[PDB]
Amino acid sequence: AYDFKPGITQPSAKSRDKSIWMSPILKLLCTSYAMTVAGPVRTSIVTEIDGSAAALSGNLRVWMRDV
Amino acid sequence: PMINNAIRSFLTAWDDIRILSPDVSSKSLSAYLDSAVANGPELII
């Protein structure tokens, strides 16, 4: 499961300085969909994030303050 | 990233100063030259 497959993904999903804890979220969302598709288990790759990965690391940080 | 936010908050904050301006064209040359028309003495009577 890839947080960042460097040739395939877009560089908006670079979780720089947050890949210590964003990559366990990104790798497990990769396996969250790999085990949902039938057939053989495929190599899962994060393609892109609609915001930045910094925008998602900021927004989960907003969520973790609320909890 | 965060550095991209300072880019678009610079270009828009420069263009908003730019669009808060009168439109410059060839009409402003005739508009300024017309100001020097009515203040003219008659010398030929």
Side-chain angles (χ1 to χ4, degrees):
Chain A
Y2 286 98
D3 55 349
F4 181 78
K5 177 67 176 66
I8 283 92
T9 192
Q10 293 185 358
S12 297
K14 289 178 71 176
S15 176
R16 59 190 73 187
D17 289 330
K18 304 295 187 291
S19 178
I20 182 173
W21 62 273
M22 179 58 70
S23 299
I25 302 168
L26 294 178
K27 288 180 180 181
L28 196 142
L29 288 175
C30 284
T31 65
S32 304
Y33 177 67
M35 303 297 289
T36 301
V37 177
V41 183
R42 294 182 286 174
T43 305
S44 298
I45 295 168
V46 166
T47 297
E48 61 180 1
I49 298 170
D50 289 325
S52 297
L56 185 61
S57 70
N59 285 319
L60 292 177
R61 186 177 175 88
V62 173
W63 181 74
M64 289 182 285
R65 288 178 180 176
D66 292 331
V67 174
Chain B
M2 181 267 174
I3 191 168
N4 198 2
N5 197 2
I7 290 169
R8 66 181 294 274
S9 68
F10 170 69
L11 293 175
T12 57
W14 189 262
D15 197 4
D16 289 331
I17 302 298
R18 188 260 183 191
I19 64 169
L20 201 282
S21 178
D23 194 2
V24 288
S25 293
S26 296
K27 190 261 187 295
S28 66
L29 281 77
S30 177
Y32 187 77
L33 189 64
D34 201 4
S35 178
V37 173
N39 52 3
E42 59 178 358
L43 283 80
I44 41 172
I45 291 175

